[PDB]
Amino acid sequence: MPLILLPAVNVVEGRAVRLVQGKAGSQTEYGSAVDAALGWQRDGAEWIHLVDLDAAFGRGSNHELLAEVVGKLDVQVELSGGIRDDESLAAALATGCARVNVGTAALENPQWCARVIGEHGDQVAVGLDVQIIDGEHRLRGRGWETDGGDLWDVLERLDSEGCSRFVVTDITKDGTLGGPNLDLLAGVADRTDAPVIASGGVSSLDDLRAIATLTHRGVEGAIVGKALYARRFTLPQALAAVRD
Ligand SMILES: NC(=O)c1ncn([C@@H]2O[C@H](COP(=O)(O)O)[C@@H](O)[C@H]2O)c1N/C=N\CC(=O)[C@H](O)[C@H](O)COP(=O)(O)O
């Protein structure tokens, strides 16, 4: 199957935004989150990667608006941000979303995370957001403010636990239009049979073709934010590119 494309809708105060390397001072904005989501659906999206960035940064919630978005969409939503306990996991799932991503809690609450992987299966994926410095692949939590440990040790543990899916970001590529980190993606994909979703850095249709070349190694899809919002290319171009 071709690479699945997931347009990102990253929500700050109800708006679709992007950041450069997850840093608040670099925020660009693209309208209402609901209009963004509906637009990508109109354009052909199979999936929306819907992120509550206020919740990821521990500074607020867009949960009600995200529930509205999920409810209005016909297509599948992968929902994340703030999903750190039983209450917030249930609230997320109660929206009717297809699945969630857990970030911080995989780092800080491994037992909880293992429990929810166990109970929820394919509805729970883990986001592995990686900052690589001098070869050290570190996970980042809490809106990428915190250190969450070594990627490979955590990946190994999650994989052992049965984690359904991993959503992998090179944080230093996220929002940069600098290209995906294909090394990191292949590295993760080669260490798990669980599907991997590539997130961050896409800058061109050729970047998507490049990620597509990894589908056989288990890279199932790619999340695309800035290239779409900035109108580097269109969704149908992208959908067509991954089938070249
Ligand atoms: N500081 C951040 O920006 C950030 N911090 C956490 N998350 C996510 O918050 C959730 C974890 O929350 P929690 O720990 O569980 O509360 C997880 O999903 C974290 O992965 C972020 N999402 C970043 N990009 C969002 C995205 O969708 C890009 O648009 C996409 O990579 C495309 O990038 P592009 O434009 O194409 O380069």
Curated annotation (Swiss-Prot):
Its EC number is 5.3.1.16, 5.3.1.24. Keywords: Amino-acid biosynthesis, Aromatic amino acid biosynthesis, Cytoplasm, Histidine biosynthesis, Isomerase, Tryptophan biosynthesis. The keyword Protein transport does not apply. One of its GO terms (molecular function) is 1-(5-phosphoribosyl)-5-[(5-phosphoribosylamino)methylideneamino]imidazole-4-carboxamide isomerase activity. It holds the Pfam family His_biosynth. InterPro entries: Aldolase_TIM (IPR013785), His_biosynth (IPR006062), HisA/PriA_Actinobacteria (IPR010188), Isoase_HisA-like (IPR044524), Isoase_HisA-like_bact (IPR023016), RibuloseP-bd_barrel (IPR011060). It comes from the Bacteria. It catalyses: 1-(5-phospho-beta-D-ribosyl)-5-[(5-phospho-beta-D-ribosylamino)methylideneamino]imidazole-4-carboxamide = 5-[(5-phospho-1-deoxy-D-ribulos-1-ylimino)methylamino]-1-(5-phospho-beta-D-ribosyl)imidazole-4-carboxamide; N-(5-phospho-beta-D-ribosyl)anthranilate = 1-(2-carboxyphenylamino)-1-deoxy-D-ribulose 5-phosphate. The keyword Endoplasmic reticulum does not apply. The active site is at 10 (proton acceptor), 129 (proton donor). Pathway: Amino-acid biosynthesis; L-histidine biosynthesis; L-histidine from 5-phospho-alpha-D-ribose 1-diphosphate: step 4/9; Amino-acid biosynthesis; L-tryptophan biosynthesis; L-tryptophan from chorismate: step 3/5. GO terms for cellular component: cytoplasm. Its main location: cytoplasm. One of its GO terms (biological process) is L-tryptophan biosynthetic process. Transmembrane segments: none annotated. It is found in: Cytoplasm. Involved in both the histidine and tryptophan biosynthetic pathways. Belongs to the HisA/HisF family. This is Phosphoribosyl isomerase A.
